[PDB]
């Protein structure tokens, strides 16, 4: 809440997926890996897998729904991602609805659309700058190769290994 943070990387270290295809990116993605400056590995109580669903609207923004299993319930969080400056980037719709949130950016780093994606998120909340990379899969499992590529990438942004987690597959809520 008050603690020091690993700095957000310059955006020059975060690639953008070439010729992003919004229609192909839609649908359900499972969070198979998660890294960030507020993300901490927890052996005592491991992060559980959650899912994020991207529905492309006629106006070209996404209605985004995250589905999580928390405290024996299904928690649903909804947002609107508005197309940003370059295809594959997004800003947050209705940002004034979010107390303390002054900046929000999504950048799709890499994806093949049918199996995996890596996506960078940065926000400033109460003037503190957070960033996250998610490794998304169309299924709950990915290859060793994709997972190591993701660790390599997360580290290139200055995150140590204790800031890189692999949520445990579950069946509740996310299917
Ligand atoms: N301020 C806290 C409130 O949860 C926080 O951001 O930490 C939560 C953490 N998420 C993030 O740090 C985070 C970073 C950049 C953009 C986002 O949309 C995030 O959600 C997580 O996913 O467990
Ligand atoms: Cl819980
Ligand atoms: Cl493998
Ligand atoms: Cl390390």
Numbering used by the authors: 3 to 177
Task: Provide excerpts from the study.
Siderocalin/Lipocalin 2/Neutrophil Gelatinase Associated Lipocalin/24p3 is an innate immune system protein with bacteriostatic activity, acting by tightly binding and sequestering diverse catecholate and mixed-type ferric siderophores from enteric bacteria and mycobacteria. Despite limited sequence similarity beyond minimal fold-defining motifs, lipocalins, including Scn, display a common structural architecture: an eight-stranded antiparallel β-barrel enclosing a cup-shaped ligand binding site, or calyx. The calyx is strongly electropositive overall, due to the close arrangement of the side-chains of two lysines (K125, K134) and an arginine (R81), which complements the net negative charge of many ferric siderophores. Scn displays exceptional structural rigidity, manifested by its near-identical structure across multiple crystal structures, bound to a series of distinct ligands, tolerating multiple mutations.
The structure of the Scn(C87S/W79A/R81A) mutant was quite similar to that of wild-type Scn, with the affinity reduction readily accounted for simply by the loss of W79 and R81 contacts and interactions. The structure of the minimal Scn(C87S/Y106F) mutant, however, was dramatic and surprising, showing complete loss of bound iron and two of three CAM substituents from degraded ENT. This result remains difficult to reconcile, as the only ligand contact involving the hydroxyl of Y106 is a hydrogen bond to the 3-hydroxyl of the CAM substituent in Pocket #1. Overall, this combination mutant showed ligand features similar in essential details to the Scn(C87S/Y106F) mutant. None of these mutations noticeably altered the Scn fold.
